[PDB]
Structures are given as structure tokens and as C-alpha cells.
Amino acid sequence: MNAERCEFIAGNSLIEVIPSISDDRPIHLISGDIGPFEAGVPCRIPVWTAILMKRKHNCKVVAPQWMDVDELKKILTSETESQGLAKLPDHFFEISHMLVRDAREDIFEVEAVKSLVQDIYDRRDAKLRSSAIEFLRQNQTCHAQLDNVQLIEASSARATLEACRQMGAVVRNKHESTPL
């Protein structure tokens, strides 16, 4: 599992667009019907389909509601105050990076949105680092709780799994060395 496959799974989310082309029938995808398209009237389609239309100039993308600057400030406030990881929308970082990559014309207040997302990422990264360092001093348990971790955050932190597997062998050796 890696970051490309995380972005691949994040592509299945739904997002709203405004077409400029028009069409009569629906489109019968294996993942379900999406059409019909009328020019100037919004509708919801998958994110991969939205990016595919945006590259061909066939639509305009409408950003999610959580990309409002006030909503991002609320998220940053909750993340600053809470000791653990705060809850986020699904595929938050992946959808942010995909939309800044392919559709930054349609985002509103782009630099402020970008800076707030970078702030949230920075302090969540610091929280995960501190939690892993404090775990690796442990000897009494082999368990931790990591509520509201994102999939890409979990994917970036797989060294801890290998370290815990190495620690368990030495602990088992001490238990077998205890006399009777």
C-alpha cells in the first residue's frame, strides 16, 4: 500500500460539477448511472470523471464546502485544542492535492486555502511523531489507540510495525530465560 493507491481510492468520491456540454441519455457506468448533462445546471459525478472533464474543458468544478476559509479555520482550531487527532473529512489531503493539481482555476481564495491545509498537515505530523516516539519507549504493552488517523498518514508510518515486531522477539527471549 502506497500513496498512489491512496490517491486511486480517493478518486472514487463524489463531487459536484457544472457542465457546458449537453447530452440526452444517462451514462450507465458499472459504478452506476451519472447523467444526463444539461449546460449550466450542476450535478454530482465521481472525482476522476470530474478531472477528466475539466482537462477537456467540458465543465466547471465546484469545490467542497469544507474548502471554505472559515471551515478550514474551524478545523485548525479543533486540531490545535485537542490532544489527539481531530476528525477530518474523508480523503482530505488527497482530494486537496488533486484539486490544487488539476483545477486550481476554480478554487476561491487559493493561497489562503493552501496555507491553512499546510498548517493542519504540519501539526498532525508532529502529533503522530510524538505518539510513535512515546510508544517506542514502552515495554509493558503492545497496543495503542490512534483514532481519526487518515489512510495516507497510516501509510507513511509503517516503520513502527517493523520496530514492534523486532521488540517482541527480545521480550519473548527474556520470558523464556526466566528461571524456574
Instruction: Give long-range contacts, CB 8 A cutoff, 24+ apart: 143-150.
Output: 146/85, 147/84, 147/85, 148/84, 148/85, 148/86, 148/87, 148/88, 149/85, 150/88, 150/91, 150/92, 150/93
In the complex with another protein, which residue's Cβ is closer, 5 or 104?
104
Write out the residues near another protein by the rule CB under 8 A. 97, 100-101, 111, 114-115, 118, 122-123, 126-127, 129-130, 133-134
Residue 153 beta carbon to another protein: minimum distance, rounded to whole angstroms: 16
Considering beta carbons, is residue 39 or 133 the nearer one to another protein? 133
Are 15 and 33 spatial neighbours (Cβ–Cβ below 8 Å)? no
CB of 30 to another protein, least distance (A): 33
**Closer CB to another protein, residue 105 or residue 111?**
111
Q: How far is the CB of 64 from another protein (least distance, A)?
A: 18
**Cβ proximity of 120 and 82 under 8 Å:** no
